Amino acid sequence: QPEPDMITIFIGTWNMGNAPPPKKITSWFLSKGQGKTRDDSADYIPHDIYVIGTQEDPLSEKEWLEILKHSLQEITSVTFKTVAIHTLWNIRIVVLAKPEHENRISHICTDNVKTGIANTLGNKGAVGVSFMFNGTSLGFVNSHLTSGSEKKLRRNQNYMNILRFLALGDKKLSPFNITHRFTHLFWFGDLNYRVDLPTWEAETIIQKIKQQQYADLLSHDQLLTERREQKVFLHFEEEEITFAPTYRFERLTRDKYAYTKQKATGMKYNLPSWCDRVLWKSYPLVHVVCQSYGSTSDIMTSDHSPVFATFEAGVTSQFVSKNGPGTVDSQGQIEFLRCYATLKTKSQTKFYLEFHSSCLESFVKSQEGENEEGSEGELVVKFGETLPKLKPIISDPEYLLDQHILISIKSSDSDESYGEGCIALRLEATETQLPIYTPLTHHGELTGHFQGEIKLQTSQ
Ligand SMILES: Cc1occc1C(=O)Nc1ccncc1
Ligand SMILES: Cc1occc1C(=O)Nc1ccncc1
C-alpha cells in the first residue's frame, strides 16, 4: 500500500460562546454554508487529518471528543483516531486522523501560551499541536487573542508572544520559532480583529452584509490592514474571504447582528467583524492549496459562526537508502557560493551562520563573515566562498530536491540569532550555480535578508 504524496487537512475554528453545541454540526466538517464551500460530490470522502480549534468551549475534553468522533463517523463511516487534545482554560485544540495514518504519525507535541500580565492574564492565549506525518512536519496553533475594536496593537503583541513562546516541533531547532519549524504551519482561532469603521455606520454595515457586498468592509478589516503594513502574521497566507462576518450574532438565529453596547459587553460596540480566521505558512515550493474557506449558516448556539478551511498539502515519505540514515551519502553535497546577509541591526559584533535540516546528521556552524557598511546605512555580512560544504544523509534527488535548509545568523558575542530563514532545495537544475534568497526574521519580525547562490549535487 503506497505512501501518500498529498493529504487533505480540515481546519475548524469556533468560538462557542460558553454554550453547548446543537445536536448536528456536520455542516462544519463538510465545509457547507457561505464562502468557498466544498462540492457535494466530496461529502463522503474523509479528510486525512481534522484539526478543531475552539474558544469559550464549555465542554469537557471527553464530551467534545464524543461529539466530534460521532459527527465524523456519521459523515464518513470512519472511526477517527485521536492524535492529540490540549486545553488552556476554555481554548482547545483536537487533532483527529484516519486510522490508516496511526503508524505514519509520530513526535506528537502539545503546548500552550498564556498572554497578558495581571489584569490581562487568565483567559486569552493559544494552544498548539505538532507532529511528523512520514517525512513532513505539521504544526497547528489555535489562538484566542485580545478582544475589542481599539486593541489591535494588543492582538499584535499577543501574536508575537505566542510565536516566541509556544514550544512545538523539534527542540534541536533552537534558533527557530514555530514560524520556521514546520513544513506546513496552520494558525487559526478567534483572532478578534475587527472591521474598523465608525460606530454610527453599524446599520450601513449590516445593509452591505445583506447585499453580500463585502469589499468596503474587508478594506477596513484590521487583520488584512495590519498584515499589509507588516505588523503581524508576516509571511503567512490567507484565502480570500467571501463569507459574511462571523461575529457578533444574536443566538439561535443568523438573521441579526447584535452590535450595540450592553452591560454584558462592558459597554463596548461589537460591529460585525471577521474575528474567526485560518492562516498558514508552508516552506518555499511545497504544495499547499486551500480548497475551502467559509462559515456555517445552521449552527446558531454561539454569537460566532464556525469557520472551516481545507487544504491539499504535499507530504514526503520516510526515506531509507543503503547509506543514510545513520551515515552521509558522499554522492550528495550542498555548496553556498557568494552569500551575504543584509541586517537591519546597529550591532557591530561578528556573525556566523547555522544551517539546520533533517537532511543533515546535525546542524553546521560556519566561520564568521566579513562585515561591510551598506550604502543606505545597513550591515552587509559577506561569507564569500568560505561556507562549509553540507553533506546530506541521502543523495537520491527524489529525496534531496524535496528538502529545505533553515538558516540562522548569530552574533559571535552573544550566540543569539539576529535572523532566521529557509531555502528550498527544489532547484531548476543540479550541478549548476543558482540564485537563492530568503527574508530573515527574528521574533517573527523582519530583520534582514540572505541571498547568494547554491550548487546542489545529487546521485543523478
Ligand atoms: C528574479 C530574480 O532572480 C534572481 C534574483 C531575483 C530578484 O528578484 N532579486 C531581487 C528582488 C527584489 N529586491 C531585491 C532583489
Ligand atoms: C530570488 C532571489 O535570488 C537572489 C535574490 C532574490 C530576491 O528575490 N531578493 C529579494 C526579494 C525581496 N526583497 C529583497 C530581496
Query: In 16-104, which ranges are E strands?
Result: 34-36, 49-55, 81-88, 91-97
Strand ranges across the sheet with 288-295: 34-36, 288-295, 307-314, 6-15, 49-55, 91-97, 81-88
Resolution in A: 1.4
Q: What are 446's strand-pairing partners?
A: 441
The H or E element that residue 29 is part of is helix 26-29
Task: Assess whether the C-beta atom of 451 lies below 6 angstroms from ligand 2.
Answer: yes
* Cβ of residue 435 lying under 6 Å from some atom of ligand 2: yes
Pocket test for ligand 2, best of 449, 450, 453, 454 (most atoms within 8 A of CB): 449
In 310-459, which ranges are continuous DSSP H helix? Answer: 397-400
d(CA 389, ligand 2 centre) in Å: 23
Residue whose C-alpha is closest to residue 274's, from 249, 293, 247: 247
Atom of ligand 2 at shortest range from CA of 435? 3
Closest residue to atom 15 of ligand 2, CA basis: 449
Report the C-alpha gap between 389 and 405 in whole angstroms: 13
Ligand 2 pocket mutation pick from 340, 441, 451, 454 by most atoms within 8 angstroms of CB = 451
- Residue 167 carries which DSSP code? -
CA of 141 to the centre of ligand 2 (A): 29
Q: Specify the experimental method.
A: X-ray
| CB-based contact 188:142 (threshold 8 Å) | yes
Distance 455 CA to ligand 2 centre (A): 17
All cell numbers assigned to 320: 531509507
Q: Residue with the nearest Cα to atom 8 of ligand 2?
A: 437
* Ramachandran angles phi, psi of 38, nearest 5°: -90, 140
CA dist list (Å): 29 to 12, 14, 70, 72: 8, 12, 12, 8
Which triple of cell numbers denotes residue 95? 487533532
β-sheet bridge partners, residue 155: none
**Ligand nearest to C-alpha 437:** 2
For the CA of 452, the nearest atom of ligand 2? 4
Residues linked to residue 405 through DSSP beta bridges, in sequence order = 423
Q: Are strands 417-424 and 404-411 parallel, antiparallel or unpaired?
A: antiparallel
285 lines ligand 2 (CB under 6 A): no
